[PDB]
Structure formats: C-alpha cells, structure tokens
Design a protein around this motif. Sequence first.
Motif, PDB file in Angstrom:
ATOM      1  N   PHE A 179       0.823  -1.206   0.000  1.00 37.21           N
ATOM      2  CA  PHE A 179       0.000   0.000   0.000  1.00 37.21           C
ATOM      3  C   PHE A 179       0.857   1.257   0.000  1.00 37.21           C
ATOM      4  O   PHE A 179       0.601   2.193  -0.769  1.00 37.21           O
ATOM      5  CB  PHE A 179      -0.940   0.003   1.202  1.00 37.21           C
ATOM      6  N   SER A 180       1.885   1.292   0.849  1.00 34.53           N
ATOM      7  CA  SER A 180       2.753   2.461   0.903  1.00 34.53           C
ATOM      8  C   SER A 180       3.461   2.677  -0.427  1.00 34.53           C
ATOM      9  O   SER A 180       3.613   3.817  -0.880  1.00 34.53           O
ATOM     10  CB  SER A 180       3.764   2.307   2.037  1.00 34.53           C
ATOM     11  N   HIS A 196       0.997   3.963  -3.075  1.00 36.60           N
ATOM     12  CA  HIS A 196       0.601   5.349  -2.847  1.00 36.60           C
ATOM     13  C   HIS A 196       1.446   6.316  -3.662  1.00 36.60           C
ATOM     14  O   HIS A 196       0.952   7.374  -4.067  1.00 36.60           O
ATOM     15  CB  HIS A 196       0.696   5.705  -1.367  1.00 36.60           C
ATOM     16  N   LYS A 197       2.717   5.980  -3.903  1.00 34.44           N
ATOM     17  CA  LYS A 197       3.579   6.869  -4.670  1.00 34.44           C
ATOM     18  C   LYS A 197       3.053   7.072  -6.083  1.00 34.44           C
ATOM     19  O   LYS A 197       3.179   8.168  -6.639  1.00 34.44           O
ATOM     20  CB  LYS A 197       5.002   6.319  -4.710  1.00 34.44           C
ATOM     21  N   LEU A 253      -0.104   7.155  -6.939  1.00 35.25           N
ATOM     22  CA  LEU A 253      -1.186   8.128  -6.824  1.00 35.25           C
ATOM     23  C   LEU A 253      -0.645   9.535  -6.608  1.00 35.25           C
ATOM     24  O   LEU A 253      -1.178  10.505  -7.160  1.00 35.25           O
ATOM     25  CB  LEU A 253      -2.135   7.739  -5.690  1.00 35.25           C
ATOM     26  N   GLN A 254       0.403   9.668  -5.793  1.00 36.40           N
ATOM     27  CA  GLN A 254       1.006  10.985  -5.601  1.00 36.40           C
ATOM     28  C   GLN A 254       1.565  11.524  -6.910  1.00 36.40           C
ATOM     29  O   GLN A 254       1.450  12.722  -7.198  1.00 36.40           O
ATOM     30  CB  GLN A 254       2.097  10.932  -4.530  1.00 36.40           C
ATOM     31  N   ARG A 302      -7.727   6.560  -6.494  1.00 38.90           N
ATOM     32  CA  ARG A 302      -7.390   7.837  -5.883  1.00 38.90           C
ATOM     33  C   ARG A 302      -8.157   8.098  -4.595  1.00 38.90           C
ATOM     34  O   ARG A 302      -8.152   9.237  -4.118  1.00 38.90           O
ATOM     35  CB  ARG A 302      -7.640   8.976  -6.875  1.00 38.90           C
ATOM     36  N   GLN A 352      -7.511   6.221   1.425  1.00 42.23           N
ATOM     37  CA  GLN A 352      -6.607   6.951   2.304  1.00 42.23           C
ATOM     38  C   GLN A 352      -5.768   5.993   3.142  1.00 42.23           C
ATOM     39  O   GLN A 352      -4.539   6.111   3.198  1.00 42.23           O
ATOM     40  CB  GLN A 352      -7.414   7.894   3.201  1.00 42.23           C
ATOM     41  N   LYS A 353      -6.418   5.026   3.790  1.00 44.49           N
ATOM     42  CA  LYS A 353      -5.751   4.145   4.741  1.00 44.49           C
ATOM     43  C   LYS A 353      -5.669   2.705   4.251  1.00 44.49           C
ATOM     44  O   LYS A 353      -4.568   2.163   4.127  1.00 44.49           O
ATOM     45  CB  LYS A 353      -6.480   4.208   6.092  1.00 44.49           C
TER      46      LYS A 353
END
Length: 217
Positions: free
Chosen positions: A96-97, A100-101, A103-104, A144, A147-148
């Motif tokens: 997940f972490s 997330h990149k 999406l950023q 997008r 969040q968690k």
Amino acid sequence: LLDSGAHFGHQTRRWNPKMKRFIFTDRNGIYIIDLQQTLTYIDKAYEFVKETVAHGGTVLFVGTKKQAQESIAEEATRVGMPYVNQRWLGGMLTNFSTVHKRLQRLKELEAMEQTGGFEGRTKKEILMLTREKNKLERSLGGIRDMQKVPSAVWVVDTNKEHIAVGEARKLGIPVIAILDTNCDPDVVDYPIPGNDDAIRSAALLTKVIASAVAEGL
RNA sequence: AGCUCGUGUCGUGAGAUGUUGGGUUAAGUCCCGCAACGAGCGCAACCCUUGUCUCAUGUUGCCAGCACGUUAUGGUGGGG
C-alpha cells in the motif's frame, strides 16, 4: 435473479468437491446452484455491508473479467467507492505504501497539466509524460480514494482474481465473494453462490451491493 | 548491453520473481502481457567537429563595380 441465470454454473468436469453443499442438481452437463442458499447468503452480505459502511467503513470492488467490468465501474462511480476494473497489480494491499507513490505522481502530474508545463522541455519528454499520464490513470481508475486501507473487499469470480483474495486474506480484511460451482468456499467468508460468467447475473449482484452501501452511506 | 537495489510475493534454505513470454530496436529501446510495483548504474540525449542557410562582420582576410599601378603581383587608393 433467476432471470439472469444465477442458477447457472460450470461443467461437471470443472467442478469442485467442496462445492457439494450448495449444489442443487446437474443438467445438460452443468451444475445448478440452489437459489435458496443464494438468498439466505445475500441477505447476510447485505447486512454486513450495511453495518460496515454505517460504522465508517469502506469496501473495495473487485472485478477484472470483461463480463463484469463496466457494471462494477458504473456502480462504484454512482456510489463513489474504490474499485478495480482493468488489471490488479499484484500487491495493491500489501504494498500500500509503495503504490501510494503512483497516486502521488498522478496528483502532481495533474497539477503539472493544470499549470501547463508542456513546452518548457523537449517534445519527446512531454510526449512521454502524457503517455505516463494516460497509462497511470487507466491502470489506476478507482484508486485515488483509499486513504488508509479497504475495510472489506467484494470480488466477482474469485478464481480469476486469486491474487486479490490472497492479499485480502493476508491482511485479513473480510472478503465477500460470489462463488461459482468451480470455486473454493474456504477462502471466502461470505459466499453468494451463483453464476459469474453472465453479464446480467454478475451485474445484478453489484446492484444489490450498491443498494446496501448506498443506504448504508 | 548488461549489472543491481527497496517493498511485496514464493521457498525450510541456498535462492527465485521484477530482468521471463509475443513483437520491436543499435540498445534491459519501446509496446503488449505478466505476483509484481518502482528505482539506480548503464543505453539514449545534453558537449566538440563536420555538411546547408540567415543576421552581425571587414584586418593582417576577400576584391565584384571604380581610380593609381609596372610588370611583379590586391601591388596600391578604395569597396561588404
């Protein structure tokens, strides 16, 4: 649901012994899934979706086979819910972490699109950024929004997307799956037996979950 | 044109995957797939020179149009 063919399944050849509980009969070489279990399971899936979304939870919609792609996509858009339709990158939940990149990058790149940085560099570079833009947006459509983490996962035809079920099991989030006669009951918590090969049969299941979350929202 | 790493996943473990498959390229170059998603060093580009043209530019460099030349020639005044 009988009109769509929720009693349809797979050949007797491709069947799974562990499926004998909810098998009703076999005709023309295919197993007929008993609909009474389907109803007495979909009510439970409904109440679970209600109690999770109402308590500030979310579900992630899983579907990759082209029979149930647009249905789940439009459902999630109409309920504003996370979903995957094109392809599941192995490790959305575990990494997940890391994901997330992506999406950023999508967000910062949309900001670049808004500011118009399309002529400050060479043509090859900006063309490659545009290619990265459409690639990352098509690969990540309903992404997008997490969040968690997803609090629950809803899948269709778990045999095709077994990596998603394996991940959701690993992190332990409950999985709600409609299982066909070739499926595996031990990996899903909340089976809703029935056909997944028909567009209509799979669609009207997504509508049911849509109603459950929509009133739960 | 290859060599690796982070996280993930598989394996008791050494390790594996990514980096394999189809296509394509000079190229791990790129595309489509794909339990992998990304990244780094490489590849490529940015540098020099060479091939075309434009603007600027006239000396010690050119001399087309004018004058002086003596044979010894832009040699000389001048001319872009």
